[PDB]
Design a protein around this ligand. Structure first.
Ligand SMILES: [Mg+2]
Ligand SMILES: [Mg+2]
Ligand SMILES: [Mg+2]
Ligand SMILES: [Mg+2]
Ligand SMILES: [Mg+2]
Ligand SMILES: [Mg+2]
Ligand SMILES: [Mg+2]
Ligand SMILES: [Mg+2]
Ligand SMILES: [Mg+2]
Ligand SMILES: [Mg+2]
Ligand SMILES: [Mg+2]
Ligand SMILES: [Mg+2]
Ligand SMILES: [Mg+2]
Ligand SMILES: [Mg+2]
Ligand SMILES: [Mg+2]
Ligand SMILES: [Mg+2]
Ligand SMILES: [Mg+2]
Ligand SMILES: [Mg+2]
Ligand SMILES: [Mg+2]
Ligand SMILES: [Mg+2]
Ligand SMILES: [Mg+2]
Ligand SMILES: [Mg+2]
Ligand SMILES: [Mg+2]
Ligand SMILES: [Mg+2]
Ligand SMILES: [Mg+2]
Ligand SMILES: [Mg+2]
Ligand SMILES: [Mg+2]
Ligand SMILES: [Mg+2]
Ligand SMILES: [Mg+2]
Ligand SMILES: [Mg+2]
Ligand SMILES: [Mg+2]
Ligand SMILES: [Mg+2]
Ligand SMILES: [Mg+2]
Ligand SMILES: [Mg+2]
Ligand SMILES: [Mg+2]
Ligand SMILES: [Mg+2]
Ligand SMILES: [Mg+2]
Ligand SMILES: [Mg+2]
Ligand SMILES: [Mg+2]
Ligand SMILES: [Mg+2]
Ligand SMILES: [Mg+2]
Ligand SMILES: [Mg+2]
Ligand SMILES: [Mg+2]
Ligand SMILES: [Mg+2]
Ligand SMILES: [Mg+2]
Ligand SMILES: [Mg+2]
Ligand SMILES: [Mg+2]
Ligand SMILES: [Mg+2]
Ligand SMILES: [Mg+2]
Ligand SMILES: [Mg+2]
Ligand SMILES: [Mg+2]
Ligand SMILES: [Mg+2]
Ligand SMILES: [Mg+2]
Ligand SMILES: [Mg+2]
Ligand SMILES: [Mg+2]
Ligand SMILES: [Mg+2]
Ligand SMILES: [Mg+2]
Ligand SMILES: [Mg+2]
Ligand SMILES: [Mg+2]
Ligand SMILES: [Mg+2]
Ligand SMILES: [Mg+2]
Ligand SMILES: [Mg+2]
Ligand SMILES: [Mg+2]
Ligand SMILES: [Mg+2]
Ligand SMILES: [Mg+2]
Lengths: 96, 64, 79
RNA sequence: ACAUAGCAUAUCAGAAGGCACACCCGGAGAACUGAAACAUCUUAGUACCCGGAGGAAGAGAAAGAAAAUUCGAUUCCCUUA
RNA sequence: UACAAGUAGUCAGAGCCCGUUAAUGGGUGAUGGCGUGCCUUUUGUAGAAUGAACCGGCGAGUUACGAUUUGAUGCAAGGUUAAGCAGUAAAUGUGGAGCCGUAGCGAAAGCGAGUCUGAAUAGGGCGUUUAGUAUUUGGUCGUAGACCCGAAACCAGGUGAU
RNA sequence: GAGGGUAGCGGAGAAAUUCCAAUCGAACCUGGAGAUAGCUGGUUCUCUCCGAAAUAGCUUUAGGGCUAGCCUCAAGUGAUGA
RNA sequence: UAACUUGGGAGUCAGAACAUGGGUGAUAAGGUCCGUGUUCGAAAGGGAAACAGCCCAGACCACCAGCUAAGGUCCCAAAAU
RNA sequence: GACAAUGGUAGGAGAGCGUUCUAAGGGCGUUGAAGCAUGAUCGUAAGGACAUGUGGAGCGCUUAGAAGUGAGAAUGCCGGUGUGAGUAGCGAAAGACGGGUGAGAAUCCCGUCCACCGAUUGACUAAGGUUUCCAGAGGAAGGCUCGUCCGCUCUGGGUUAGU
RNA sequence: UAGGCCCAAGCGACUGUUUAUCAAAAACACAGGUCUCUGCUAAACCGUAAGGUGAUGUAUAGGGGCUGACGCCUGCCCGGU
RNA sequence: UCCUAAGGUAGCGAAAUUCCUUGUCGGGUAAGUUCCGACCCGCACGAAAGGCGUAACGAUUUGGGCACUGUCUCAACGAGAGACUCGGUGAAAUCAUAGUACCUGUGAAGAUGCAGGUUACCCGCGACAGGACGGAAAGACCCCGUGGAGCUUUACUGUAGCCUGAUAUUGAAAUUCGGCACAGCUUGCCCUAGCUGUGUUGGCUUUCUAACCCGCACCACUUAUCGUGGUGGGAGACAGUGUCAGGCGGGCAGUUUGACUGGGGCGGUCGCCUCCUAAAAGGUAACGGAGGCGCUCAAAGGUUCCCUCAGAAUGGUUGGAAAUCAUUCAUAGAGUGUAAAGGCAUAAGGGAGCUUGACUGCGAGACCUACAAGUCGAGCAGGGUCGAAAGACGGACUUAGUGAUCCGGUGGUUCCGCAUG
């Protein structure tokens, strides 16, 4: 309340909407993938069990922050272009 | 009981990474013939909630 | 019975100098707010649509004589 | 007119009335108040009144929830928030 | 203590009477200096503005649930359980559903250490280039009567024509 | 005089806002109920350090309030202050 | 010898006199409205008889010590008949 | 050791005093607890001891915990007690004396005289009250004084209908 | 114990009534005047209704408005409501 | 002669009405703002919110007499109750503690309590009321509170109720008049003015009886002015009643009805721009002193090129003091759309050609600033205009010419689309 001056949150306008079908992904970066032994088959179940991912949300997306230092076969619902490139370049493989 | 979010403010702001509140701009509804091209162009750009306003309103958006 | 027809004035516009002779300013800094050219733009200084004088480069402000009756403000790059 | 009101008699551990200022279901239903005034809105389907209970009541075995490897009456707690 | 002008004490001080938690003591006070109670409310109150006859008792920021901040402690890219069940109305065990954090940007599709705007590899906004989380002391706020007392009134159902 | 009738969003009134149980511009009691009171009053132990304001802006605002200004506590910066 | 930034907590939004620059009023007001300074407010102590706002001066506590400020030195009444 | 700061209302910050209860430890007490009272005691403050008297059975202390935790003011609430003050008042009026009674008499009883009402202060009686009526006894309180008396207190009685 | 009287003026015709408890009046009422509604399950009034008052009355009656004994009178305007 | 719906008649009139006003004149008195009579310039009488009279009446208002008197001159005495003294009994409001003088001053501006003087031995009792801004009641006047309540209305929003239509309850029949469509004729493929039938669609009006109604009669239940049932009569698809709809609706309800203000009201004002006040940065008040704004321009914008005023003197026709022409002088006294100020003659003023930058994305930095906003801005990119080119151009010499959010309309959109499209 501002003593009768039109309050801020009435002088400013509303914006936007919320998407009913909004999707959000549990994200995993390459630096986090670095904990699995080279040759590992990283899957959503393995990520959850290992505790890298707690809440899977709409699925696992791999992102490219940090450096991958291991060869892995990564199964996830989505990949950043950079994440897929790093996984392949380290000799590993990725699949959606 | 739980505190209640101020729903109008929630419809008018978004919280940024450092905890600030992104806001849209007043004077963007009508009467555009009375505001210069430059005025309207720049009113198109979002701002933040000022520090002095934040002191007053922060509890309204604690859950936001 | 009694009333005044006066009692009006507009908001003051905060005209005048905004930076000092000898002060370093960055490009775009307003140097002088005015009606008309009470002061003229000198070297590396521009005059906006409302007669405001502003610096075009980083440098030192210098208020200078312009002829006999007029004056200007210029901005010079520091060595 | 036929018999239908009506009238008379007999039977019935049939009803009635009370309350525990509680809980339940339903009928009907405010205002001060908040909105820094006020009418939509709020207070609130709250208080008060009334009817009906029961030891609990109400609800209940999908013309349901959903959108997968689907679940399988109702009620209640946590969470969703 | 009966020649004296007093918010009553205070500082100085003879005289007189005492003798203690024994201390450079206690009671009284001729006389001198100084000095217009307290609270509230006020620009300012000795105020002739307010309140209290006196004494005693009683008499006003609390608790719950949320928020935020600070301190404390445990663990830490993790942290933590809720109901429930067991237990002595306990500690506690179990319970990972859930919550917060580990990634942002966008109205959104979405993309992602970047994203949005933009025709733009431009410029600009918000971000990246570690630290959180659980419980709890303190502070403050929100919802509750929310520090306490006080209306004139409004509404509902009753009681009254002695 | 006796026995009775009319009851409060109502009665009654040869009319005065007049009477309805010793104050009627709307009786009384109980409840909603701790109505609301931006007003007045009150708010209880001690010492130590710091120490304001009575202004601007906006306000159905003017003895109220909000943000700024001025106080305080802590952490940070580091000479940027006089 | 401060200053600035961020965060926790505030109070304040009735101001007064005096001096001075001005408006207003009547070169009226202990008037009223701005600028500037001080003091009061929230400041005891000394002076101005008494006297928030003037003059001197900012009380940590104790002393039956000293020097000064404003102001004073015949008596009340300390100090020069 | 030095030398610097320490007036202060709203208000911020800090450190503490004291109250009741709880936990644990350690104590006191009929050879006298708490409470109360007095004293010339101690600490920078809130406050803490000690002695003696009263009292008669409970209570400190240490550390930590928790709060119905501190009053001088609210025309505050309840109680007690002052002041005004031996003051205002003692509520329409005519009594006097004698004799009784009694611890005590203007005030009770009896007598004489006097005075007052008399369309009434008389006699009935309906409402209303509900034992106040009668007898004996009493004198705390009530009675605006007194009291031996009373509508008061105690004890025992009292209301009779075919009309 | 038991009328003071008289001359004039304003107001209300009069006897009545009223602010229990600061107003008794020139205020109310009034008999009279007028307007208007009402054909009877009347109009008006109370009530959600039923049921009532009006009225066991019927236009010489009943409700409402205004005026206010009596005498002499009551003019103009229907544009507005 | 203007205007009106029409312009106040009779009666009355300084009045329960007359401000001025104690009007003026007459009466009454020694003296009369009152009273009575008269007058009429009725501030602002007047005919049933009746006009003007009016005998009787009145605890009515008003003026004058006689009588009367302690009302008064002007007070005195006497009787009784209280007061006073004594015995008995014994409250109250009030109250920060009180050893509680006066004067002149001081001071929150009117002092028992402060200063300086002045006066004053300690303690009662009967009396008086100047002060203790004495007690009593949280001022009732005044203002304030986005307080309350009662009341009004052509304030707002509602609503009881009433009126009106549709529809249900709700049926039968006849006449008559229309809309639409087809067909035939019809007069100046289809128009215009018409006509007869043909099909549904519908109105108005009558008639009927069986629903419904009767605070109508009679009959029974039944000792009953209720009720129910039966019969007759009346009425009748109406009325009544339900749902829906429009109108009327202070009858009744909930509320609103601003602030500033040398108290409040009334008047004025409320946002924005310029100047002065303003104390040579900026800022700075008053119901201080002066004015403007709520636009305008398609060029009065951009750019290129070119140009220079107002006025005066002297000559010249219609022509004058000023019209248009000519020379000279003329430094800004002109012009700059529009207030003022600051600017502008290297033009920001004037003329012409070509034009649409009065662009799209933006924007380092800066001013202003509580916020929301407001202002300036180089420069980069795209695509342009003018210019030979440098280059200029994101409106106008500069500063007013404006209004948040919510909601709704319109256009665009490689956004979303509640199982999927
Ligand atoms: Mg839009
Ligand atoms: Mg200006
Ligand atoms: Mg411009
Ligand atoms: Mg409200
Ligand atoms: Mg309110
Ligand atoms: Mg059941
Ligand atoms: Mg003596
Ligand atoms: Mg103050
Ligand atoms: Mg005052
Ligand atoms: Mg006094
Ligand atoms: Mg007061
Ligand atoms: Mg008092
Ligand atoms: Mg007390
Ligand atoms: Mg609270
Ligand atoms: Mg009666
Ligand atoms: Mg009456
Ligand atoms: Mg009245
Ligand atoms: Mg009464
Ligand atoms: Mg309530
Ligand atoms: Mg209350
Ligand atoms: Mg200090
Ligand atoms: Mg407003
Ligand atoms: Mg003054
Ligand atoms: Mg003043
Ligand atoms: Mg000043
Ligand atoms: Mg002082
Ligand atoms: Mg002195
Ligand atoms: Mg010396
Ligand atoms: Mg001397
Ligand atoms: Mg201090
Ligand atoms: Mg000091
Ligand atoms: Mg504190
Ligand atoms: Mg307490
Ligand atoms: Mg005596
Ligand atoms: Mg006395
Ligand atoms: Mg006496
Ligand atoms: Mg007496
Ligand atoms: Mg007597
Ligand atoms: Mg007897
Ligand atoms: Mg006695
Ligand atoms: Mg009469
Ligand atoms: Mg009376
Ligand atoms: Mg009377
Ligand atoms: Mg009349
Ligand atoms: Mg007439
Ligand atoms: Mg006369
Ligand atoms: Mg009249
Ligand atoms: Mg008339
Ligand atoms: Mg009359
Ligand atoms: Mg009479
Ligand atoms: Mg006597
Ligand atoms: Mg006596
Ligand atoms: Mg006092
Ligand atoms: Mg004075
Ligand atoms: Mg004195
Ligand atoms: Mg008084
Ligand atoms: Mg008052
Ligand atoms: Mg109303
Ligand atoms: Mg209301
Ligand atoms: Mg006002
Ligand atoms: Mg004044
Ligand atoms: Mg200056
Ligand atoms: Mg200036
Ligand atoms: Mg121009
Ligand atoms: Mg779909």
């Amino acid at each position: 309340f501002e003593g009768g001056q039109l309050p801020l949150f009435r002088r400013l306008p509303k914006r936007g909407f919320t998407n009913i079908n909004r999707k959000e992904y549990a994200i995993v970066n390459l630096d986090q993938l670095n904990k699995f032994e080279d040759g590992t088959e990283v899957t959503p179940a393995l990520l959850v069990e290992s505790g890298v991912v707690k809440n899977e949300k709409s699925g696992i997306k791999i992102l490219g922050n940090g450096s991958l230092d291991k060869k892995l076969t990564v199964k996830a619902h989505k990949f950043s272009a950079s994440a897929a490139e790093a996984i392949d370049a380290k000799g590993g493989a990725h699949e959606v | 009981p739980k505190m209640k979010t101020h729903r109008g403010a929630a419809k008018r702001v978004k919280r940024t990474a450092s905890g600030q509140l992104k806001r849209s701009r007043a004077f963007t509804s009508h009467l555009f013939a009375n505001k210069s091209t430059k005025q309207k162009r720049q009113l198109r750009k979002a701002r933040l909630v000022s520090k002095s306003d934040m002191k007053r309103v922060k509890q309204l958006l604690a859950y936001k | 019975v009694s009333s005044t027809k006066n009692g009006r004035d507009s908001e003051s516009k905060r005209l005048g100098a905004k930076r000092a002779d000898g002060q370093f300013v960055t490009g775009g800094s307003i140097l002088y707010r005015q009606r008309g050219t009470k002061i003229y733009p000198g070297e590396n200084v521009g005059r906006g649509g409302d007669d405001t004088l502003f610096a075009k480069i980083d440098g030192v402000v210098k208020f200078e004589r312009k002829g006999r009756d007029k004056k200007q403000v210029s901005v010079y790059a520091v060595a």
